Design a protein around this ligand. Structure first.
Ligand code: SO1
Ligand code: GDP
Ligand code: MG
Ligand code: MG
Lengths: 158, 816, 197
RNA sequence: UUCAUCUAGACAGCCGGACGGUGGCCAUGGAAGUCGGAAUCCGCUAAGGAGUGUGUAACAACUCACCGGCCGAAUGAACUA
């Protein structure tokens, strides 16, 4: 009924675990169950990945929407063809993400990000992707980052 | 009451609006029995005691209940504070309507105070709080005047946190406040207590100030501001030298001056204060020192027995008004049946509704009067009554008896009072039952009277100890003692373990030790010894019988070739709950077994028997090709499988999830050489041989344990579980309450003393319940005596008297 | 280290000779997130440079060779200070710097500059927080299933530092009593220093 | 003895900051720097570890690496006997 704002990380396209949201939402009155499917409605595209979800709860109504986050956007941009949950430990996902995607990812974060130019944000996401373990343009993200440094992979400052 | 009149209690009880059915609940040592003794002081296990209190017009009108008259009868239960007895307090809560919360001023709100209020507020009981041992803060902690007030405020605030969290959203306003008169303060040991509402009356007789407005001014941020006579609501700095509040300066101050003068031996000042407070003396109290003059003056100045019962009469509900919102809670039936409505009315002329909760011993072995609460109708001594069992369903034949009562009786202080009849909504016991009601149930008259709820309690029997007598010939006296203990104490559980062991189950170590003490001395009368119960294991395989098992008959004319299979657990679970049943028809039970469980269809039809006992979770498969005389030895083969699956070859325990695939059989032509005496031994040895090559392993039972614990103490759950190999499954939180619920798999092997370990690690706030769930296969070899699974086998064999080593596959196998 | 040290000299030299105006800002009790926010606001318009008080003095003292006028900067370079360089309408530059003030959360050990109070209000926190209030002695009631303080309590008295118990309750209720932001001690431009006012 | 830091302010001490992407990849019932395996990135930077410890069920909240404010001339470490 107010500006109350929650931030839960849930695997996409699935209702959050009871222990994940039911303790927090419900002290105000909203039953967890229909909130649970609310994230599912937001997360359809981000299904199979633990994405952040903002909750703008007001008048027993939770505005569920995926919060753009480096790890989430990078992996879902590659679209991560169906990842077998029972495959093995240390689920690996590297694929090959294009420069076009990562700079487009940086735009979605450029608002919140603290970079000066777009080049700063783009190398930032590449640093994120290295942790995620991807392969930007068949090359290590660090190598592209230093490539951006010595005027090799330019960034449209728009 | 010293034998006022047998009819007079009956006549007063007839009034259903002037009666108070309450139980006193508190922490273990917060003085609840002393307060109860002080309540019975002026009246001349938990047996109900009844109290009589008169009243006047002015304070009887100030009662938010439908009532008429000026005398009241109070029904009191002495509930136990120990968590190990947290089941009979639930029994008290079902049989009562009000709760007197005794609270320590020194210790405050403790763990068991937290628990009992949760029980009371779950059962929709209005609590009233009394803060006892206030004398301790005055003489031990030396709180002057303001620290005592602050402790009271902390105590009231702490109680209301419990109330606000656990009060159902049907009443809401059941919060406890001293201003409304719902909180009392006093010292039960010295026999003095008060309420600010009572104190507001004392000053009105001299000041003439209104009493309705003294409630919100004698408590809280409210100051008299003397030298000006203006009741300020804040300190205001008092134009300098900030002044004290009304609670300290009007209520606590007269108490403290009496304490200071009397304890400091101001013989000139004691009479001055006493004559000011209009007290009464005796012929020997003038010659009195401290610690005894203080007790007599305080009981006379502010009598606890007078404040407390008036506290009950005002705020604690009557039966006629609580059953209105409680009837749907005790009645699992619909809300729109005549029997449900008769509960709400509390009318003594409808069909009978008497919930028996206790079996009160009679000083005679096996008479056990049936204590309970009448809900609807009037019971008469010598009337046909339909007894219902806990699992009674009116639709079909169930635990319904058509017996009658011999005598309706009133409970009092360890004496029994027979009366002809009793109206609805009070406390009554019955003579002539305990041969027709094991633990609990209801006593009714209607044909559409469903039994009410089972009276769920927050605890469960989690401490398991095996019991058996040193004297072998004294076995029946123990089992007679066990059955007598099972009916005396309502929470103790006696049963037989799967290893033929007598098990006594209790809530905790203290409760179990109480019951075991009863066995040794009171109930059985025979000295018995107590040990941890023997865990019953199962024997399984985790491979495919690396080479074929070959066994020869004693005459060598018959040979059995077979192999072992690790049957899938889902199929094993299916068999034991009746999905795959031997009495079903083959080629149809096979189809469910094959299509719905992934097995081979041909094997599914070719079923010979289940083991053990003919319906166990073990299988024997006819994998044989065409062969002459299988069908004549089929009976012998299944009998040996029953033998082999009942006593396994590792340490003699039942087989589980073991499939025997009989690859080939070679039988003599003449039946006299392939009889039972030749096939039964050879199949069992072949099965024993087949088992020992398919990586034999042992299965331990695993408890499914669920614990309710508050947030502060959840850490102890994981610490104990991770030390006792527990496997945490899931967590949840109840809506609004901070109570966690942890579901985990705690192995039965490492499950003795777990509750004692859990209670110490969580500070007693954790409440575990356990039930057998499944069998888990240990990964270590049970034939390696130095393995974690091979020490169980070695230990078990020694206890059974078998040898230390396990006979290898070299035995049971014939070289061919 | 010296090569790294000389690089800051080069950066300071370049700024000193390319930005007519520079803002001497006191950054006491200023968080790093706050500093990031200020730089974002001033981005494009201006550049913020911090450094070691002694380092800049030696840098400025040496730079006097080409740019003598900068001598007047030195005496005011003391305490936790930084340099915001701009070529912009200073008033707007000054406003943004001194308006980014962010209320720092109450912290245990910070000397209280006034009398912190917990006024009677509907805190909105669920009843499992009464311990925090009970710890400080604050009288509370549960109205509408939430903590309601009954009476004014002075949680911290002026002067005496915020205790751990004091701070914990205060951070729950968001009663942060001290705000910090980049304050300006001097303004240099057109080769002249003068106060912000 | 060797290697380092130091008037471009060293060590100690007191006080301020110790961020953003980001809840980095994961499995884990839960793990958000701090049960763990692998990876040790980028931006803002005077500076901040995909975190040295306390702590949590996990968050939270403290703390230290790192940089600053004060002071002002020396100091630290590892070795040798
Ligand atoms: C109310 O309490 C109930 C259950 O809830 C509880 O699980 C308890 O468990 C008892 C055991 C039940 C297991 C299954 C029947 C197979 C093996 C049995 C056990 C081991 O031998 C495991 C638990 C613990 C008991 C051994 C160690 C003595 C069991 C037994 O009765 O033998 O049973 C009582 C009757
Ligand atoms: N000083 C003081 N001691 C008390 C009071 N009430 C109980 N006690 C102590 O508690 C002990 C037994 O109390 P009891 O009523 O049996 O505790 P219960 O288990 O709650 O019934 C006695 O030894 C008393 O010293 C009280 O009001 N004041
Ligand atoms: Mg007692
Ligand atoms: Mg952790």
């Amino acid at each position: 009924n107010e500006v109350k704002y929650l931030y839960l990380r849930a695997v996409g396209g699935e209702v959050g675990a009871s222990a994940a949201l039911a303790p927090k939402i419900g002290p105000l009155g909203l039953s967890p169950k229909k909130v649970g499917e609310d994230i599912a409605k937001a997360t359809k595209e981000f299904k199979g990945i633990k994405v952040t979800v903002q909750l703008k709860i007001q008048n027993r109504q939770a505005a569920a929407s995926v919060v753009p986050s480096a790890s989430s956007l990078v992996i879902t941009a590659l679209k991560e063809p169906p990842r077998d949950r029972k495959k093995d430990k240390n689920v690996k996902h590297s694929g090959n993400i294009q420069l076009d995607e990562i700079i487009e990812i940086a735009r979605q974060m450029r608002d919140k990000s603290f970079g000066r130019t777009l080049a700063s944000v783009t190398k930032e996401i590449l640093g994120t992707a290295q942790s995620v373990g991807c392969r930007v343009d068949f090359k290590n993200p660090h190598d592209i980052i230093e490539g951006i440094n010595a005027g090799e992979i330019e960034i449209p400052e728009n | 009451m010293v034998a006022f009149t047998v009819d007079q209690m009956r006549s007063l009880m007839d009034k259903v609006t002037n009666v108070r059915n309450m139980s006193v609940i508190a922490h273990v040592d917060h003085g609840k029995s002393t307060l109860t003794d002080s309540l019975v002081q002026r009246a001349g296990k938990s047996t109900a005691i009844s109290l009589y209190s008169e009243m006047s017009d002015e304070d009887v009108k100030e009662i938010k209940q439908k009532t008429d008259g000026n005398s009241f009868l109070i029904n009191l239960i002495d509930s136990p504070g120990h968590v190990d007895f947290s089941s009979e307090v639930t029994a008290a809560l079902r049989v009562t309507d009000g709760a007197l919360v005794v609270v320590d001023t020194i210790e405050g709100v403790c763990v068991q105070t937290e628990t009992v209020l949760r029980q009371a507020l779950g059962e929709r009981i209005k609590p009233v709080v009394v803060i006892n041992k206030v004398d301790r803060a005055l003489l031990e902690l030396q709180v002057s005047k303001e620290d005592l007030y602050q402790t009271f405020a902390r105590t009231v605030e702490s109680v209301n946190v419990i109330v606000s969290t656990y009060a159902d959203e049907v009443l809401g306003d059941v919060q406890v406040y001293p201003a409304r008169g719902t909180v009392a303060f006093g010292s039960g040991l010295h026999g003095w207590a008060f309420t600010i509402r009572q104190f507001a009356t004392r000053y009105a007789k001299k000041f003439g100030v209104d009493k309705a407005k003294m409630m919100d001014r004698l408590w809280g941020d409210s100051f008299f501001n003397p030298k000006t006579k203006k009741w300020t609501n804040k300190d205001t700095d008092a134009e300098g030298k900030p002044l004290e509040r009304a609670f300290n300066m009007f209520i606590l101050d007269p108490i403290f001056r009496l304490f200071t003068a009397i304890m400091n031996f101001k013989k000139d000042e004691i009479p001055v204060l006493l004559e000011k407070l209009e007290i009464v003396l005796k012929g020997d109290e003038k010659d009195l020192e401290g610690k005894a003059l203080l007790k007599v003056v305080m009981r006379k100045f502010l009598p606890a027995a007078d404040a407390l019962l008036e506290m009950i009469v005002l705020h604690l509900p009557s039966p006629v008004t609580a059953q209105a919102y409680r009837a749907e809670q005790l009645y699992e039936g619909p809300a729109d049946d005549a029997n449900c409505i008769a509960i709400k009315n509390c009318d003594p002329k409808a069909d009978l509704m008497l919930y028996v909760s206790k079996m009160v011993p009679t000083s005679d072995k096996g008479r056990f009067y049936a204590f309970g609460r009448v809900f609807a109708g009037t019971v008469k001594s010598g009337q046909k009554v339909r007894i219902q069992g806990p699992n009674y369903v009116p639709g079909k034949k169930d635990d319904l008896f058509i017996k009658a009562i011999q005598r309706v009786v009133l409970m009092m202080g360890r004496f029994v009072e027979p009366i002809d009849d009793c109206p609805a909504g009070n406390i009554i016991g019955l003579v002539g039952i305990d041969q027709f009601l094991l633990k609990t149930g209801t006593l009714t008259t209607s044909e559409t009277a469903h039994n009410m709820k089972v009276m769920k309690f927050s605890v469960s029997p989690v401490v398991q100890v095996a019991v058996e007598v040193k004297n072998a010939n004294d076995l029946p006296k123990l089992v007679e003692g066990l059955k007598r203990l099972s009916k005396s104490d309502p929470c103790v559980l006696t049963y037989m373990s799967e290893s033929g062991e007598h098990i006594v189950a209790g809530t905790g170590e203290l409760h179990l030790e109480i019951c075991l003490q009863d066995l040794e001395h009171d109930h059985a009368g025979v000295p018995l010894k107590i040990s941890p119960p023997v865990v019953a294991y199962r024997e399984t395989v985790e491979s495919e019988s690396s080479q074929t098992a070959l066994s020869k008959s004693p005459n060598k004319h018959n040979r059995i070739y077979l192999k072992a299979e690790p049957i899938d657990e889902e199929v094993s679970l299916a068999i034991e709950n009746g999905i795959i049943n031997p009495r079903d028809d083959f080629k149809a039970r096979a189809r469910i077994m094959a299509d719905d469980y992934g097995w081979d269809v041909t094997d599914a039809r070719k079923i010979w028997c289940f083991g053990p006992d003919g319906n166990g979770p073990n299988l024997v498969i006819d994998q044989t090709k065409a062969v002459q005389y299988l069908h004549e030895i089929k009976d012998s083969v299944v009998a040996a499988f029953q033998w082999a699956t009942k006593e396994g070859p590792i340490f003699g325990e039942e087989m589980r999830s073991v499939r025997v695939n009989i690859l080939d059989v070679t039988l003599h032509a003449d039946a006299i050489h392939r009889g039972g005496g030749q096939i039964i031994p050879t199949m069992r040895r072949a099965t024993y041989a087949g088992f020992l090559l398919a990586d034999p392993k042992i299965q331990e039972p695993v408890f499914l344990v669920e614990i309710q614990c508050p947030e502060q103490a959840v850490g102890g759950i994981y610490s104990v579980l991770n030390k006792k190999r527990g496997q945490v499954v899931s967590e949840e939180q109840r809506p609004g309450t901070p109570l966690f619920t942890v579901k985990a798999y705690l192995p039965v092997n490492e499950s003795f003393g777990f509750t004692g370990e859990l209670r110490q690690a969580t500070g007693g706030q954790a409440f575990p319940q356990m039930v057998f769930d499944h069998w888990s296969t240990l990964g270590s070899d049970p034939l390696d005596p130095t393995s974690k699974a091979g020490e169980i086998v070695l230990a078990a064999r020694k206890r059974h008297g078998m040898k230390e080593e396990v006979p290898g596959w070299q035995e049971y196998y014939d070289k061919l | 280290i010296r090569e790294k040290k000389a690089e800051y000299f080069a950066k300071l030299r370049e700024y000193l000779e390319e930005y007519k105006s520079l803002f001497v800002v006191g950054v006491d009790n200023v968080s790093s997130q706050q500093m990031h926010e200020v730089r974002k606001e001033l981005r494009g318009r201006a550049v913020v440079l911090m450094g070691k008080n002694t380092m800049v003095r030696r840098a400025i003292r040496g730079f006097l060779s080409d740019l003598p006028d900068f001598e007047k900067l030195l005496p005011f370079v003391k305490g936790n200070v930084g340099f915001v360089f701009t070529n912009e309408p200073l008033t707007e530059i000054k406003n943004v710097i001194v308006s980014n003030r962010v209320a720092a959360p109450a912290r245990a050990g910070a000397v209280a500059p006034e009398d912190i109070w917990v006024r009677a209000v509907n805190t909105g926190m669920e009843p499992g927080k009464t311990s925090f209030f009970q710890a400080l002695g604050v009288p509370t009631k549960i109205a509408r299933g939430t903590i309601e303080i009954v009476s004014d309590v002075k949680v911290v008295d002026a002067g005496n530092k915020v205790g751990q118990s004091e701070a914990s309750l205060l951070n729950l209720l968001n009663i942060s009593p001290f705000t910090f932001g980049l304050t300006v001690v001097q303004v240099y431009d057109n080769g002249q220093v003068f106060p912000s006012s």
